Amino acid sequence: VPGQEETVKNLEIFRLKMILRLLQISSFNGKMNALNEVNKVISSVWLTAERMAEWIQQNNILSIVLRDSLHQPQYVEKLEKILRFVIKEKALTLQDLDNIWAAQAGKHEAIVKNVHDLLAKLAWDFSPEQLDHLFDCFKASWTNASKKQREKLLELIRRLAEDDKDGVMAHKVLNLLWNLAHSDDVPVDIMDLALSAHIKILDYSCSQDRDTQKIQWIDRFIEELRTNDKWVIPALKQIREICSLFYRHDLINQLQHNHALVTLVAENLATYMESMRLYARDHEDYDPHVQEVQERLNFL
């Protein structure tokens, strides 16, 4: 009937109401059936791309979904498509991402990686504001992170880089790796993991981005150790694996023309041997220091 227009929208909410209750059903069969029906209507999408996205928003559909249903990887994969739909018309909000990152707060190790799995696949469609807020959430998690929590954060962080189709998000990812590997508050066993992730991220992400940033990133690494505040120990070796992989025979000459590597390291040795001996007259009642001297000669 052509005249039954408000009737179609009246029932359309009624079916939407029934679906939401099906999500609210504690039965797992109902919730997966509800998502499949949600998965079908999104593909069909008078329900435009913004009305259903809004309908998910104020109803807090994902808030109920992420509570317990995340424990099954098969369910999350279906959940990925609708969340992509919510993102692509800019419907997800900051608090929604907070709930996404709240799913890893003290729960089982099973679901936390699936939350990482969904975010990594959702990373490309996230807006820059969404991406940086996630990085801010990572740093806040990093402050209270545990030993197992820190490594899987890097595992999540390295998941953000290899899938980066355009080398824009990778720049912020490398900034975190530079921040983390240079953050003295974090023990040494993470330091290598943060460095190693940077090594492979600069390795796997060749595409059209790798060597071009190499010179910039290797020079920035030299620049970091051009000031003596204990950045030298990580920065010097960080260069070493880069030079081992990233032409190489002329690269040493290219990095010796005006940013001389052998020459500059000589002062870094000199400028720290003096500093060590400054307190070696009053604080000599200590122990060797050896790692600092050993590594510096190793790089040279």
UniProtKB/Swiss-Prot annotation:
It is found in: Cytoplasm, Cytosol; Cell projection, Growth cone; Cytoplasm, Cytoskeleton, Cilium axoneme. Induction: By growth factors. Widely expressed in embryonic and adult tissues. It comes from the Eukaryota. Deubiquitinase involved both in the processing of ubiquitin precursors and of ubiquitinated proteins. May therefore play an important regulatory role at the level of protein turnover by preventing degradation of proteins through the removal of conjugated ubiquitin. Specifically hydrolyzes 'Lys-11'-, followed by 'Lys-63'-, 'Lys-48'- and 'Lys-6'-linked polyubiquitins chains. Essential component of TGF-beta/BMP signaling cascade. Specifically deubiquitinates monoubiquitinated SMAD4, opposing the activity of E3 ubiquitin-protein ligase TRIM33. Deubiquitinates alkylation repair enzyme ALKBH3. Interacts with SMAD4, MARK4, NUAK1 and BIRC5/survivin. Interacts with DCX. Interacts with OTUD4 and USP7; the interaction is direct. It is linked to Intellectual developmental disorder, X-linked 99: A disorder characterized by significantly below average general intellectual functioning associated with impairments in adaptive behavior and manifested during the developmental period. Intellectual deficiency is the only primary symptom of non-syndromic X-linked forms, while syndromic forms present with associated physical, neurological and/or psychiatric manifestations. Intellectual developmental disorder, X-linked 99, syndromic, female-restricted: A form of intellectual disability, a disorder characterized by significantly below average general intellectual functioning, associated with impairments in adaptive behavior and manifested during the developmental period. Escapes X-inactivation. Belongs to the peptidase C19 family. This is Ubiquitin carboxyl-terminal hydrolase 9X. It comes from Homo sapiens.
